[PDB]
Symmetry: C4
């Protein structure tokens, strides 16, 4: 029966290693698929890894050029947790160069987007059959979250942007129930630009932390009520800035406008915004997608003077990172929702020229009420072995 | 319980990408099987891809010569949708160099044909056991559809041709129920030659669009009543000609004879013939198996002056195509049968001499009542990487 | 519930291709396992292929020397029908250099034998757990059938030989029920030597056709009653001789002694002995394991003057063959037991020196009451591609 | 429902080959994973193999350096019995460089440990979800058994050591029920150092035989009562010494102190201590991890003058061995628990310098009340083929 967001978040007093696939290490001598934009998403019975295939293996010739985002040869695949995404084990969800996928308790909705830049469309699959289709409304790269959505009693909202990336676009919040559109609504609130939303839910409410590609170095937040099918947006108030590139941390930050400093750029990220129990991930570097850290900044959302009270490094500054996103196993046993997250560890081009490809690995963590010690989690491939 | 063709076709206002496997791209660096004559066919619970193996991998030595149609080393395999047909994941349906396979609601019938040219025979498997066998009646390459049949309340008819390909042959329409022959009947109507029939059903009626190899550039149609176990044949009236090679589109076409122009040749194709809601696929080229397009030609079947009112390009003229065929997921949720189809994208010999093999990829589409934008769907392998 | 041999054999008016794996063709460019002594055996729900692994892939270095029968690195594996026996898909039944395996309706018994030549022992697995063990009684290569046994209402007898191969040995017929020994009895009748028994059952009776390695060129037959747990042996009377090497067909043959001519040698074979409905497989060559043919010799068992009344070539004389054996899908739908059989197609050493290995492929057939045309079924690998 | 240790051990009158994977042989030409610290562990329905991945294939470049125990790229994997641990077939249990895993009748608990040496922590997974976490208490390489634990009516105790390896450490016995900690207690008894405990249970009692790394050449034993959740420790009295390196067998040995001779070293081992029905495995060499033998030494535990009355060689002195451990299929049919065990056959570095890696194979045996003949079970790879 349909899942219902009835619990709240657990106390995050630290994070533990949940998954890790070592795909590029293993990809050096096995038939692993060139991927990017990963995520993790849970069924009632298993959790799996998800990414967009580039339709080729790493050591295969046709990997030269996989730095490009959109093509006819990409697809959404999922595979068993902590396994490299291989040719013989992956399952294709749908054919597309942007995606999101979530399970509603009853079965799973997966949405892939394809097309030329000016004539793209999305197909909503539900129970591995195509159900519903939607065309560009603004005719400029229709795109979605690049991580799992969240349902509540049958209703799974999904954020789409169609339009410019260096200026105003058109963002809709669609509400689906059984693959069918119930309703949609234009973006609202005070966020000036939305891209790559990273979402979760507890106590009958959904929270996405997205990406202002055009103006903000602080991240905008969409908060959705899946029952009333309404939403609102805002930015994160705290001055611990968390996009990338980003200027240095000020002592005061914006609640309702972009923080200026970098233009027309960023990276996918997430946050868990739960009062004093609020954490933020970011690249350590303000210039590259390098390093990854979590920071506990009580009332980040609303207290525009907040600064960290505790922290944890996931990946060292000398290691490469990339996208990151939220997920939770809503079907886990127990009293509260244990928060999880993933970082994409991109290897290859641009930052590593000697090779002609671009892939990534994954590392996944979930929280602990314990105060566990920390390690760091590099991709661990040796690029010279690919030369 | 046995499936029953009780719905009608949905409104096709465009086509969306359904599947795609990138096998030859991926085949460059994985253990993928050299195949041809693909198709797609649905079970109650999953849809899969189907093709005849050449009993060898692409990069394997024994791929030299896979331009030949019939041998002891071919087989019907199926695999998970949008996966390349690999050595470690394919399932063998039966041993044969021609085939068809369909599910009757209760379980699946798969028919492979083998033998020398003058002493071939077919074995009807049902529930993965062999049940019934049939010998050449005309002792000249017994052959079937090369795509899924259609049942209705237990009764799955299948079209076979035995005889010449450049002249008169003998075509029987067999009716099976549980793998057993109920009845068969010689071809009737006004079609002069039948090969490679592409079939579907709605509202208790079955429609195959086949191939006059010897005379016609317009395609003959067999229409079957699975309840009365009778059939009839005809040609498509419209002058938008759809075999290949074919002469140029006239302004008037034959309802009951072949349109002349090319002799002793053609390609497998399909159509959906549903009044004003009628669509036709064809190669864009009139000379090569190149490009693929869909065209909406209201009353193609019967109105011998009809010309397109809307269209969609699946594969550009500069890309290679090949066979194409119909399928529908009869077990999908909803009110009408959503029409689907596939194009085989042949690579290698003849048209690509530098290599000694012949394989293919797949792209599959299904309809949408939406008016979606279009992309094009090349195989996307780079043949020079195989040199 | 336990299976019961209640039907009789169907009319074999010809044989159809049932399975074929092309393993050595495919083995040239995939991770397939070096095997030998194959067979096919059925569960209630699927039929699979079975062979002894040499613990190495064909293209792998450790394939040099796989001409040897017994070692610590062999195992019984099974895999999905008509798939090459690959490293990633095979299942290990047990660890041993001789075997047999059968399903009793309830679950499956698999028996592997290992050890040094003078201290070997057998372990009876049942439901994938080890249950019962048996030591050499004559301390000279304890060995079993190399193909599936047959049960009836829970009771599966198995023939073992312990002793010399060029002279008298000690052969026991063990009766198992649920992996446990019910009883065993020394060989009886007039057969002078028993090896590699090939068995089937209908109408509550079991028939094995085995191998006199030391004296006979005509094949001895053990007939078992699984209910009374008694047996008897005999030779086949007909002069269509069917071991190999063998002298030429006489006009009269032995019912109760070996036919002389070749000493201390032979090959695994089978027959179906059902009155006028009696068929015999053999190598076409009297010198090599080459070619394979079926011959219909009414009352072969008992009429010592019988000669063929119809025939079918499975493999041409110019192609290599090897072991062969009986199986039937006792759980198939229908009124009679449809007879099946397999031929091992050995490649490599001895007869093909240029390579350092010895493997094989499979071809499987089952009967048809039809009179189907015939093809021939070579392994189809090109040994030069391995050089 | 929860499993309950209600039977006793069967009579071990010898040991039979149970499993064997030939991974390094097969690893020479397939995508097998570099592993070590294997074990075998049973579910209600299947038994599988288990080891820590080094996150790389043997023939892959990133195998250079896999002599190191702890890193970010290790994981616990399991795979189907007697299959090589391959990239496409393994399942990841959890991310860690030390482990144990057991099934409680209802579902399976798997515990992996990761971290830097001075800030490691353990996560207890249960039903493939993370449940409970535990941090270093002594801040010096927190480590567990490296083989399966044992439950009884829901309660699975596990031994952990945190501290020095060449001196006093801190060892806790934790009691889990459903992944949750019920209780834990410091080590007690007269054992001076505990590492790598190898455990089993019958008649409602649990017996681990562990490793005094710092002082003893005789092995300490922890005996646990899972109902009263108490334990005690002791050493094995017999003078048939069974760690490695070890001095030569004295004529009298310690019941309550270490036997002196080698310092700060050893290897994982096991014993079955059941009165006159007591067996001990060890390396044949007293200097290297070479050879493996079983010895029947009645009342080893308690009779400090005991010497072997019967024996069996598993691996010859000229072959390499390594860790070894106990398991039993508690869900097997029958009256008593049949004892099983495994030996890790390490290949590569240190003892084999020509290669830059370190992997292993497995051989598994279980007992027989029979008196079966013996063979020996080398890994069987040829290291020169890797040069
Ligand atoms: C639909 C698509 O191509 N999106 C791409 C997205 C886009 O370029 C940015 O969102 C500005 O609009 O970002 C990136 C990138 O690594 O930054 C890759 C994505 O796949
Ligand atoms: C049984 C068989 O070999 N049929 C072949 C079929 C045949 O040559 C044509 O139908 C004329 O009879 O067409 C082709 C081809 O690509 O055109 C390949 C098919 O496998
Ligand atoms: C146990 C064993 O090794 N048997 C072998 C068997 C034996 O050599 C013959 O039966 C004479 O005794 O025959 C052959 C062979 O291809 O002829 C290989 C078998 O595996
Ligand atoms: C946690 C860890 O690294 N343990 C290692 C363990 C340790 O070095 C010894 O127990 C002394 O403390 O032994 C060995 C070894 O082959 O001997 C490898 C283990 O993985
Ligand atoms: Ca930005
Ligand atoms: Ca034509
Ligand atoms: Ca003989
Ligand atoms: Ca020691």
């Amino acid at each position: 029966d349909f899942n219902n967001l009835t619990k709240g978040l657990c106390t995050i007093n630290s994070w533990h290693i949940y998954g890790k696939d070592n795909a590029v290490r293993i990809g050096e001598d096995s038939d692993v698929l060139v991927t990017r934009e990963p995520y993790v998403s849970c069924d009632p019975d298993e959790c799996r890894f998800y990414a967009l295939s580039q339709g080729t293996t790493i050591r295969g010739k046709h990997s030269n050029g996989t730095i490009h985002d959109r093509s006819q040869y990409r697809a959404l695949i999922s595979w068993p947790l902590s396994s490299p995404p291989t040719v013989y084990n992956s399952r294709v969800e749908c054919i597309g160069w942007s995606s999101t996928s979530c399970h509603d308790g009853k079965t799973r909705m997966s949405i892939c987007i394809s097309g030329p830049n000016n004539n793209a469309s999305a197909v909503i699959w539900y129970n591995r059959r195509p159900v519903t289709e939607i065309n560009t409304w603004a005719r400029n790269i229709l795109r979605t979250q690049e991580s799992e959505c969240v349902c509540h009693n049958g209703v799974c909202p999904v954020v789409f942007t169609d339009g410019s990336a260096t200026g105003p676009a058109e963002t809709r919040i669609y509400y689906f129930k059984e693959g069918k559109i119930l309703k949609w609504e234009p973006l609202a609130g005070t966020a000036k630009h939305i891209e790559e939303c990273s979402c979760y839910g507890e106590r009958a409410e959904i929270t996405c932390t997205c990406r202002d590609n055009w103006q903000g170095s602080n991240r905008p937040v969409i908060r959705i009520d899946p029952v009333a099918m309404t939403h609102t947006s805002q930015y994160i108030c705290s001055p611990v800035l968390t996009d990338n590139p980003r200027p240095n941390d000020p002592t005061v930050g914006k609640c309702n406008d972009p923080y200026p400093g970098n233009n027309n750029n960023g990276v996918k990220g997430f946050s868990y915004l739960d009062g004093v129990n609020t954490w933020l991930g970011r690249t350590i570097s303000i210039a590259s997608r390098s390093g990854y850290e979590m920071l506990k900044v009580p009332n980040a959302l609303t207290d525009d003077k907040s600064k960290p009270t505790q922290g944890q490094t996931i990946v060292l500054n000398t290691d490469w990172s990339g996208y990151s996103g939220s997920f939770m196993d809503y079907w886990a046993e127990g009293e509260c929702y244990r928060a999880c997250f993933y970082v994409e560890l991109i290897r290859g081009r641009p930052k590593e020229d000697k090779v002609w490809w671009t892939s990534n690995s994954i590392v996944s963590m979930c929280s602990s009420t314990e105060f566990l010690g920390q390690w760091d989690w590099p991709d661990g491939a040796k690029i010279e072995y690919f030369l």
